[PDB]
């Protein structure tokens with residue numbers, strides 16, 4: 421079928437959509453842009469085509485292996501009270517006369533409605549359910565992306581999603597997929613897995629496979645296979661009924677309706693703004709790739725999967741032979757409706773492989789021992805930091821990034837230094853800030869950062885010193901390209917920040933002592949002092 425059919429109704433905005441950036445961080449402001457519904461049609465073209473699927477015994481075997489592990493899972497129904505408490509405080513309100521604030525408080529109005537929606541789910545398993553469609557505002561650096569299309573149902577339905585399925589998507593994918601399940605590893609844990617599975621091959625080869633508009637390539641068949649998997653779990657008969665109804669009424673497809681309530685069309689592939697999306701894309705990406713591997717006779721594969729992001733490390737057969745089997749792999753994925761973006765390519769250096777927009781690099785700790793940490797090209801982080809210091813937003817990529825990439829040269833000298841400069845300058849150190857980790861929203865106290873970092877990265881994250889040339893180039897170029905003060909200017913800024921912090925005692929002096937010990941010259945002796953990196957929730961409207 422066609423992934424999407426369109427009525428002609430525009431995909432419409434909610435309020436003003438700033439495309440441009442209104443400075444000590446970055447000079448070239450005309451390189452930072454934000455996507456708008458103005459880019460919607462261009463995206464619409466990219467994301468709509470017919471889908472021709474052809475399976476094979478490799479698909480059917482993997483799926484059978486998958487359903488057998490899924491059968492050892494037992495999942496429970498979530499109470500209204502529990503489902504409500506998971507909803508973010510600024511989650512889009514209901515078109516039925518209540519908001520997320522009402523939900524969280526267990527207002528009897530929201531809750532009675534949620535009940536009514538669950539009752540309807542149990543009685544009617546056919547009638548398509550209504551979704552809103554929207555162009556996302558995401559910031560990028562120039563060199564030019566169309567807005568991505570977020571699709572999601574009403575708040576009432578979402579609390580029901582949570583009820584029927586939150587426990588299943590928190591638990592199942594780990595069991596089905598074991599060590600390939602990306603979202604069980606914190607970044608340190610993900611480096612360890614990548615580094616160890618690389619060391620464990622005689623003669624290693626690795627490729628990342630970027631799939632062309634994944635959400636579009638997910639067929640209605642795919643989303644039913646996905647249900648059949650969820651159903652293998654041991655379940656309440658009421659949860660099974662709800663799960664059947666939600667996939668048939670919502671996950672498979674339904675009507676698109678814009679901000680002004682006009683009919684925009686109809687969708688027959690993955691919706692980005694539902695609870696099953698991460699789990700679904702992960703199970704569906706793991707199934708197809710695992711099969712493509714077998715088709716292409718790849719030797720002794722370990723895979724890592726986070727939604728639609730794929731990395732395979734395997735045993736090389738030779739540079740010719742590798743290049744070749746990769747083309748078979750690609751043909752296999754295409755048959756499975758998971759065609760390629762940039763075509764994939766063998767690497768023989770872990771450092772050059774990029775997965776989850778990120779890669780492994782090494783540097784050295786206090787005593788001189790070699791140490792592997794996760795990193796990434798810092799362009800989107802700086803961009804968004806630039807953006808986020810300019811216009812106020814209640815999202816803070818900067819803080820999530822400081823957490824994910826704490827050991828990195830850039831997060832320490834640029835992000836840490838900058839925002840701590842602002843937090844001190846505005847006396848806003850004690851304030852909780854909300855940030856995204858694997859699509860879930862956590863409320864974090866910036867002053868806690870030292871412990872947080874100690875527990876996810878160890879003390880060496882406060883003392884890492886000889887970063888690799890290739891990484892130092894990436895960073896310094898990124899800074900020239902974006903017009904950001906070179907690294908020597910931050911060292912001097914960071915000495916100021918560190919000192920002001922040190923004077924305030926308590927957790928503020930501990931931030932200063934630990935976060936900025938890289939910047940002193942004579943270093944202090946740095947001694948010691950979560951359900952976070954468990955599962956992927958992007959799109960699923962989750963708050964802990």
Ligand SMILES: O=C(O)c1ccc(C(F)(F)F)cc1
Pocket residue numbers: 606607610726775776777778794824858859956958
């Ligand atoms: O899903 C994500 O947004 C995400 C995935 C992976 C990573 C990391 F690089 F640490 F592996 C970070 C964020």
